[PDB]
Design a protein around this ligand. Structure first.
Ligand SMILES: Nc1nc2c(ncn2[C@@H]2O[C@H](COP(=O)(O)OP(=O)(O)O)[C@@H](O)[C@H]2O)c(=O)[nH]1
Ligand SMILES: *C\C=C(C)/C=C/C=C(C)/C=C/C1=C(C)CCCC1(C)C
Ligand SMILES: CCCCCCCC/C=C\CCCCCCCC(=O)O
Length: 388
């Protein structure tokens, strides 16, 4: 009695602290890797609100499970599934979890050892095994650090959720009516807080420059046609950016002597790269690549203070082209890691971006060698071209 009540007090302070740790740790992870951490904090918030209320009514616990369990499948399936396979998995797992929790409440509210007690146990165990068998099959396409991090998510549920049927069986294998609530509370505190930490641990590892398996920049553009021109002075870092995106092989062509072109194609997205400036006889040939250009990326070496003025003249002359009147401008203030590098505010000032009228533009300080800022700039450019 007095011991079964002390755990209800610790879990209440535990679920709130879990929400406190997850929300406070969501700052040290990239914003694109926060959707799972926020849902994990929502799970601990729903648990804290119910564990404050919880002669002892068990319906408050099953109301907590019927809401949090499918939400924990949401933060798990989002790691492996994306589109149509995601909504079909969340729907099936959410239905299976509803039948599991529903069958348990049907049997637990009945008399222990009755036929309704075991009927609810059988159906719940069947859906329980179904959910666990599908969880084992998930993550087959994951590689590297995400495969390891998702394996910890799999093992925590596969092992941690065993406590629940054991707590359900306890009242009939002995005089263990309070052990059922103890095992439920320990399992709720361990699984819900633990999964949030593992989702946070996954977000910490996902938010990084590591792109061995070339997945970081994949889910930004979608399926629409998107022709992107990425230009800038020589040595600005353009070829380095193309390698960092890891969206495909760089196709290098020399249509005429003195004119070098690089292209990368992925789905219906494309980047075309050449140097601006140089000989005046090469300039007219750029016109053969301007039509139907949606995004214009200008890469500038922020450490080259001697040629920052020549970079502006090339940008403005490019923006004067009538075929690029609707092109969305994205300025990459590259090489921010160098000691003499000008910040994004000074690059905007020296490039005169505030004088541009009727032009949807954005400047992003980047380090192409490490990849910092590349995702933020492309995410903005993708948002402009998809939502227009
Ligand atoms: N420190 C630093 N160096 C960079 C960065 N981006 C490119 N570079 C260097 O710039 C040199 C040439 O860049 P490159 O990609 O060929 O520029 P491109 O001629 O416009 O294609 C390379 O040796 C890179 O090491 C960066 O963000 N930081
Ligand atoms: C707080 C959220 C969690 C992970 C709750 C999980 C509960 C279950 C896995 C319990 C299922 C049951 C089974 C497998 C058999 C008897 C009836 C139960 C509902 C206790
Ligand atoms: C073993 C008996 C299992 C009983 C119920 C299984 C739990 C939920 C089933 C939901 C299945 C949704 C579509 C099935 C097709 C599929 O998943 O491949």
């Amino acid at each position: 009695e007095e011991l079964t009540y002390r755990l209800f007090m610790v879990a209440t302070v535990g679920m709130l602290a879990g929400t406190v740790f997850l929300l406070a740790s969501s700052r040290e992870v990239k914003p694109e890797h926060r959707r799972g951490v926020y849902i994990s904090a929502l799970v601990c918030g729903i648990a804290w609100y119910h564990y404050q209320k919880m002669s002892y009514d068990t319906g408050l616990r099953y109301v907590d499970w019927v809401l949090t369990v499918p939400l924990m499948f949401v933060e798990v399936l989002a790691v492996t599934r994306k589109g149509a396979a995601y909504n079909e998995a969340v729907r099936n797992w959410g239905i299976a979890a509803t039948v599991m929790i529903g069958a348990g409440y049907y049997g637990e509210t009945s008399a222990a050892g009755s036929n309704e007690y075991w009927t609810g146990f059988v159906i719940a165990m069947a859906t329980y095994v179904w959910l666990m068998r599908n969880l084992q099959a998930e993550g087959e396409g994951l590689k590297g650090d995400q495969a390891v991090a998702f394996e910890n998510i799999k093992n925590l549920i596969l092992v941690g959720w065993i406590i629940y049927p054991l707590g359900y069986i306890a009242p009939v294998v002995g005089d263990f009516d309070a052990i059922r609530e103890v095992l439920y509370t320990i399992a709720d505190i361990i699984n819900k807080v633990g999964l949030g930490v593992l989702v946070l641990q996954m977000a910490r590892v996902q938010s990084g420059e590591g792109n061995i398996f070339a997945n970081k920049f994949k889910g930004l553009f979608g399926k629409k046609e998107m022709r992107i021109l990425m230009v800038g002075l020589d040595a600005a870092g353009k070829t380095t950016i193309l390698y960092k995106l890891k969206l495909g092989e760089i196709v290098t062509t020399i249509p005429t002597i003195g004119f070098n072109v690089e292209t990368v194609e992925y789905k219906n997205i494309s980047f075309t790269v050449w140097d601006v400036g140089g000989l005046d006889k090469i300039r007219p040939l750029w016109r053969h690549y301007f039509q139907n250009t949606q995004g214009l990326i200008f890469v500038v070496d922020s450490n080259d203070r001697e040629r920052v003025n020549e970079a502006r003249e090339e940008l403005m002359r490019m923006l004067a082209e009538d075929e690029l009147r609707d092109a969305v401008l994205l300025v990459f203030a590259n090489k921010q890691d160098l000691p003499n590098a000008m910040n994004a505010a000074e690059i905007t000032d020296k490039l005169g971006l505030h004088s541009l009228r009727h032009r949807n533009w954005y400047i992003q300080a980047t380090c192409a060698t490490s990849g910092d800022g590349l995702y933020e700039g492309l995410d903005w450019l993708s948002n402009q071209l998809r939502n227009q």
